[PDB]
């Protein structure tokens, strides 16, 4: 980003990063969402933080 040359970047990338393996694909699993609650009790804290997400 910025005052850069795309051709120079491509040449350097071929010089250095051209030998990386074509490894196995990114894992594609099922990440299940579990509704619920995680509550930490600290009555000495000056503020209470509550995040609710869907």
């Amino acid at each position: 980003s910025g005052a850069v040359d795309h051709g120079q970047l491509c040449d350097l990338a071929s010089k250095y990063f051209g030998a990386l393996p074509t490894g196995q694909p990114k894992p594609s699993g099922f990440t299940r969402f579990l509704g619920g609650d995680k509550r930490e009790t600290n009555q000495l804290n000056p503020l209470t933080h509550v995040a609710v997400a869907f």
């Binding site: 579990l34 509704g35 619920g36 509550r39 930490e40 009790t41 000495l44």
Partner: protein, 85 residues
């Protein structure tokens, strides 16, 4: 729920809580079958043991009273059959 005796007891006795983490699952993500048969079996075992423990004084007193009851019943049968009432 405030201004209650148990809340006052909590505030008098227990400290300001710190360092407790609770994890709860929604009931929609928990199977009711869950830990069902295991709990049935182990609770039944526990109750059998406990009732075997705390029921034996009752068993002994019941045995003694049954002996007395049998004696009294046979005595009264003899009394009535002999016109001795």
């Amino acid at each position: 729920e405030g201004h209650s005796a148990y809340v006052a007891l909590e505030q008098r006795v227990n400290t300001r809580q710190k360092g407790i983490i609770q994890r709860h699952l929604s009931p929609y993500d928990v199977d009711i079958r869950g830990n069902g048969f295991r709990q049935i079996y182990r609770l039944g075992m526990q109750k059998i043991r406990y009732f075997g423990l705390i029921g034996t004084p009752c068993l002994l007193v019941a045995g003694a009273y049954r002996g007395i009851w049998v004696f009294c019943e046979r005595l009264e049968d003899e009394r009535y059959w002999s016109n001795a009432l």
